[PDB]
Symmetry: C2
Subunit: 620 residues, 2 copies
């Protein structure tokens, strides 16, 4: 019944009928994206109208089309032919992951390049990599993919251990032809294998690890209704899933006494880019928008109990569309469970003689995706004390290259002759705020040091200052760890018992933002990544910080365009976009398969409640 | 057996006996500090020589003394009379905690101040607060404690809810004299109670929390030998305990193949200070060095199973000395256990068809202490991948004051008329490094952005630079989050298989450091807290960043003095001192009992291993 329920296989099937029927799904068509649109602002909109947005591709060459369909009425709301050169190409299709290798196979320039290196074409894997936008005017309006080669000695071999440097190719997936092949020279192909399941490399497996059993004899403390509505320790939300964004949280609210109080209307990772900092022409064009270009949701893994998610786990198997419009279920793609989180509050009082201790817990909603060599875990956490947190876990196999003789200032050595180009993993969390309602404002809070003198004779005083962001033109902020800079989202119309506007404080990890030169193509296409925080006025069509069609888009799209409307955000329906990421200088320890590293952010209540919201937790 | 074993009851009793025989522990004497000393560098000794250091206070007013005894040989190694006005007073005695209230109870000035506020003296508790060093000439050379009042309505009432602002008294705890009583005017004493166990405030307790059972069927994976020697998943270390520093980690090493490789010789929290930022004369002198002045270890709580420490826990019960030299055991004062830590590594490869997933775990060594209103948990973690991490958890009841009628720039309002002065909790981690041995050096590593142009035509390049700190004079460093600054400790004489010096990288949280004006008393007394990292050359007598005697001691000792020696630290036995802390602007959510907030740091291997050290970890 809920307008926020997950998409059912039946809804996907219907969309499919509409399209084909309207002559939109011919054998030359392929669904590049399909997802359900969220309900529109306003409760008066009684009786929901389930609508789905779709991006249609064409293997022949016909212009792609953005189509919106209504499943509640089985009709086509709109259908627009797209001029990709203007608004960007459609997301990469999984069925294209092989085309790059299959095309270069019959190309003489490539075969010549392989022959010179003595490499068997049957053993050469080619990664399907986003092209970006550079000095190649020919690529304008064309659907291109570049290819870097890796050698796979046998079917179970890890090709990443054998990168073929000094060589790169560009290909047109639609016209099925190789536009260019570049060979800057021969580099030795790293010989050592990186097969982490090979007893010769792993050595004798440990027998020292004793089991750790996590169980809930009485079942979980959270209830799941309507298929995806979660209720846990006063929290209330809907777990959604999009093929592009992945897990999306809707209507996060907290039951404070006798009232459900909203906090965040929608939270998601709206984009994630991996820019590389190797100036070599072979990879200098390398920037992967795992979310915008590849769609991380479609590659979500099926999580195995006891291996991926331990304890009492409640799963969700989201359904998505395949390239032809058929519904495909992602079995156990979302894990939901609660876990112990140490001490919550504790005090042994010297005067009252009372000794008090309480345990903390966190609700976990997660998924794990795979994009080529990378694997990312996306985790959302809800704590007893009202804290909301997001954590990304990066693992997988590092993208490799050859390690230059004489060293490198932009590549690190992992093994003999094997290198790993420096790069970053930058995320954008889109937080459609709703602190006690939609009337919100953001304030930048800095710690303020004070000078010794009148009114501060001992020079011990320190304070803080808050600056309201009133217009979008002044809502692009940078971090300042030195002054403990944070951002508070409050509701000027809703006050706590102390007559202070209720709010939530966003705590960033303050990691470095986009490092590329300001005039680079990536600085333009991933402008959101150059600043830590953006605040915009909510708009139904502003979904991603990079725009709807990221692939091969010239730039300036997304946030830079939105912010240009310079709209009022002081006590309005606003959205916070927080940029955060990891800057990776690969270590030897990252090879052959890297240990998880993490990054994220959290928001804690700031005068939201009238006192601690966990005084009613039992001693257990 | 091991020279790093915990002190035994017998050893403490022997120290007492030795001191008595030497005529240094008469009935007027009191032990303010007593701890075992670490063995001297190099096997300069044939057998073991357990030495203990003691600070002897004299209640009759005689000069205190610092003594070192060899319990092994039953001798006094050194004994020196202390001139406290010059080198500092001894740490506060637990037996002096009640003296402040008792003395003021019959003081005419104090009684008059209480009468003006219609407060019954029998219900007024007085907190025994360290005095620091300010403009009161008569305090120099005298053992002084300052007192702030809080009303307790009944035996089990939380006094912190009823602060008596506008009043402070100074007391000489030795001569039993009230030196000063300052009354700046009456303030309304907050009326609301802060009793978090009162049903009227907590409301009906939750019945929604289902149990989480954490057990280990075959017992833990770690072993304990020699009472405190731990061996877990290739890690090796000795867990010590000191009444001042609390838990101290000794000889942290990792078994890499057949060789036991040291990483850190000694790790501890060498100091922790709580500076307040309220310019009111009633609290502007407040700076609590919980470690240096109060000795946090002395107040470690006895941890209840399934409450403070969940799962299969192994406890250590350290023994310390009481005021008379008699051994006192802190039952179950240290918890040790291993806990699951999600995914360690994961990758689903598109070309090999191999799906790989491995889980992480961490060894936990912790204790929890209480000092007045505060309660802190100190946690050390050891991960499978080689990471070492420290985490401090701050909870308890916030220190209160009245909330001024017209608001305040240095105090937050928690309840009607109840305020909480701004303050910081700043820690100092002393890491006596030994990366693959004692020949170490520290480099400061910053990310380096590059300009678009020749050699970087696309402007995507980014690098990093490392600056070796060669002399102590150039080793006082500050954080730079924006540039991703970290510090690497390496061994220039020990290289990995790629011919690179092995090392570990310190990742700080980059929280604000000491905010006080540089000319303040606290800025000199806690000079260490003004900078994020300090590197010194090892010395037996350089143990605390604030020196041996912090109580009522001005500047003149500690890191600033040690650094003046400007010793060579480029490939020598060095010590890293990392400053990190929380800047607390109390929220309403922090009242009546505050939820845990955290801060810490970690060190990850950086080319220490020749490849991932967790390839030998089994499936489950
Ligand atoms: Cu990376
Ligand atoms: Cu605090």
């Amino acid at each position: 019944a809920s307008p926020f329920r997950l998409a059912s296989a039946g809804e996907i099937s219907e969309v499919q009928g509409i399209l084909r029927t309207a002559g939109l799904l011919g054998p030359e068509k392929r669904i590049a994206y399909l997802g359900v649109l969220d309900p529109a602002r306003g409760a008066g909109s009684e009786a929901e109208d389930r609508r789905f947005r779709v991006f249609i591709h064409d293997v022949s060459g016909a212009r792609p089309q953005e189509v919106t369909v209504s499943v509640t009425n089985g009709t086509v709301i709109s259908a627009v032919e797209l001029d990709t050169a203007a608004t960007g190409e459609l997301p990469v299709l999984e069925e294209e992951f092989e085309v790059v290798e299959q095309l270069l196979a019959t190309d003489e320039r490539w075969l010549k390049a392989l022959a010179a290196r003595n490499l068997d074409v049957s053993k050469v894997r080619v990664a399907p990599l986003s092209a970006g936008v550079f000095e190649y005017a020919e690529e304008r309006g064309r659907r291109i993919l570049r290819g870097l080669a890796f050698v796979q000695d046998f079917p179970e071999d890890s090709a990443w251990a054998h990168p073929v440097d000094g060589l790169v190719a560009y290909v047109d997936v639609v016209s099925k032809e190789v536009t260019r092949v570049i060979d800057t020279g021969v580099f030795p192909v790293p010989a050592e294998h990186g097969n982490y399941t090979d007893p010769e490399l792993t050595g004798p497996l440990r027998t020292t690890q004793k089991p750790i059993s996590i169980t809930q004899p009485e079942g979980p403390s959270f209830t799941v209704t309507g298929g995806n509505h979660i209720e846990w320790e006063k929290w209330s939300l809907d777990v959604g899933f999009d093929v592009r964004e992945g897990v999306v949280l809707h209507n996060i609210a907290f039951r404070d006494g006798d009232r459900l109080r909203p906090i965040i209307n929608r939270a998601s990772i709206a984009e994630m880019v991996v820019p590389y900092g190797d100036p070599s022409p072979i990879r200098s064009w390398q920037n992967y928008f795992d979310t915008g270009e590849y769609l991380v949701g479609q590659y979500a893994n099926s999580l195995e109990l006891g291996c991926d998610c331990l304890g009492d786990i409640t799963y969700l198997s989201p359904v998505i569309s395949d390239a032809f419009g058929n519904p495909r279920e992602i079995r156990n793609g979302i894990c939901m469970h609660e876990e112990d989180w140490g001490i919550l509050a504790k005090h042994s009082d010297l005067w009252s003689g009372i000794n008090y201790t309480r345990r903390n817990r966190r609700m976990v909603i997660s998924f794990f995706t795979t994009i080529g060599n990378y694997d990312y875990g996306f985790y959302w956490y809800l704590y007893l004390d009202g804290t909301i947190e997001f954590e990304a876990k990066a693992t997988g196999v590092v993208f490799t290259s050859a390690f230059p003789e004489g060293g490198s200032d932009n590549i690190s050595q992992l093994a003999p002759g094997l290198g790993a180009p420096f790069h970053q993993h930058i995320f954008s969390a889109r937080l459609d705020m709703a602190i006690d309602g939609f009337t919100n404002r953001v304030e930048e809070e800095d710690v303020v040091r004070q000078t010794m003198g009148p009114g501060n004779e001992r020079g011990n005083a320190f304070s803080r200052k808050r600056t309201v962001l009133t217009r979008e033109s002044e809502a692009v902020r940078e971090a300042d760890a030195r002054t403990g800079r944070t951002w508070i989202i409050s509701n000027p119309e809703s006050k706590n018992r102390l007559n202070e506007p209720v709010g939530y404080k966003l705590h960033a990890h303050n990691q470095p933002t986009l490092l590329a030169d300001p005039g680079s193509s990536i600085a333009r296409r991933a402008a959101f990544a150059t600043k830590d925080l953006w605040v915009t006025r909510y708009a139904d069509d502003e979904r991603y910080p990079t725009g709807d069609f990221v692939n091969q888009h010239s730039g300036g799209a997304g946030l830079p365009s939105y912010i240009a409307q310079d709209r009022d955000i002081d006590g309005q329906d606003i959205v916070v976009w927080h940029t955060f990421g990891l800057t990776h200088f690969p270590r030897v320890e990252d090879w052959p398969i890297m240990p998880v590293d993490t990054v994220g952010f959290k928001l804690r209540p700031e005068g939201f409640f009238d006192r601690s919201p966990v005084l009613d937790v039992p001693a257990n």
